[PDB]
Amino acid sequence: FSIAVTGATGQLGGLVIQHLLKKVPASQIIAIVRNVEKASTLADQGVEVRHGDYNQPESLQKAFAGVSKLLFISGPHYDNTLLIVQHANVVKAARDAGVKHIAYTGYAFAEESIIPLAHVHLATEYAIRTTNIPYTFLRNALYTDFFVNEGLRASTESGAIVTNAGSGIVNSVTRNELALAAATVLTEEGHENKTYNLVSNQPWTFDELAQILSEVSGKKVVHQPVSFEEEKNFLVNAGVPEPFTEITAAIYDAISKGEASKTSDDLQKLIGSLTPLKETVKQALKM
């Protein structure tokens, strides 16, 4: 029976579907999406598309009708209090539709977290627990892709990666590997009523990232450590709009305080060997 993926046109959701397509027939996968025009790509691959908007309880009732396994990918997180309402609507719709298994993309080590979004994930986990639906909490790390992407070309150019993270440790993993973990979990037995903290057991620092970028690119790049307020200003000056520049500085600050410093073998046990940071840097730069 069927596997449905919310957030299916998003980056993580699209990768989950691409991994599911290597495991199950396309007819067995259901893409649940807010913008049905966006999901054209998917329909061509033989994946059924349904409209499901977290702001619209009725739309979710219909989208979840008859689905056996649901991958509930968390919403974009501008307004955390709104996100709780949206997530609560999703869980109730899932309960009402008689969904037989629910997997939820949470946040690793949320109980120890110092960023506000951890609260949303824990509230959502408790909401799913009230349903009595067999669950899997896929507690994802921060995305390596947030830090390691084509944007690093700017750092190759300037000779510096500028952050306020200090020597904060980073347990990030790529969206690709987190998507693979979600797909693996959805398509095999044994993961009912389990929580996984899906993080790297080979963490890195920004010093290390600069050294790897230096190695790959041939240009000397240093990590240049600055204050929170120096970071916010550096980013705005580089054309990052003030809200996102604030979010980025806040994530670096949490990192400087150990936010991403805890590890687990859960991910490696689920999917096998993890992608070395250097390979991700090479891909990001196509170098």
Add this chain to the structure above:
Amino acid sequence: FSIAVTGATGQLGGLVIQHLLKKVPASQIIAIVRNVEKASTLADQGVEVRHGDYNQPESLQKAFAGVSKLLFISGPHYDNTLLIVQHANVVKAARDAGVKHIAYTGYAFAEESIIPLAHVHLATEYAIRTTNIPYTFLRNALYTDFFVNEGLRASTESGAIVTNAGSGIVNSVTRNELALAAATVLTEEGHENKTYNLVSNQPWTFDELAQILSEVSGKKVVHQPVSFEEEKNFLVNAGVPEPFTEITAAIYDAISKGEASKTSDDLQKLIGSLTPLKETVKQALKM
């Protein structure tokens, strides 16, 4: 400035208002209610009544308009998954209205609890945390009134209190004392960003309750211990409808497993001496 109480026509809410009326002028209190006709009694006392229905986000936006301190009393708990949605609507309405302080009636020791409703309370606490509003989590014990009420006359008549609680320990406190604690907290400094586990530090067993009922009434009453299924059937046979009889047996079963067996001095520190169980038995029976 103003203190608003949701669930104001309910048993706990009405007692909070009666305690607030001994501390602050009636004009400073706002009763927020679903059924405005029910709140006639309150309006006669000079308490402002507003319509606020947890199913109606717009109604809550208007009810919370301009309120400084909000006592969010949890909804009735038939459907736990629906309750999460309702509670999420309340918290968002409170955030949007710019409520300056939120107190929430949660459940003591919820993290260790084995009843499903604990999950709702923890989800709601995490929701309130996302707002950044200064909070007080008034984590209430089970109500002594659930077990000790006029219904005990039936036990005086039969010579038996019949439960499936065994020798399970009970840390219950009366609605009256929990309401007093809520009112105390609302009307003094120092309780911002605090969690209180509001329970008895003089717990009791059903054996003890039968002995106290025997003492007060002059008739020998024993505690007669039965199975879960024997309890459910005993209650239905005594005219308790099958859903409530199931809930009652489930609460006794949780008690037999230590659900209400943990204590704290938080309540006694907040309100002073606690009401002896024997005094509550006398009141319940007017004996």
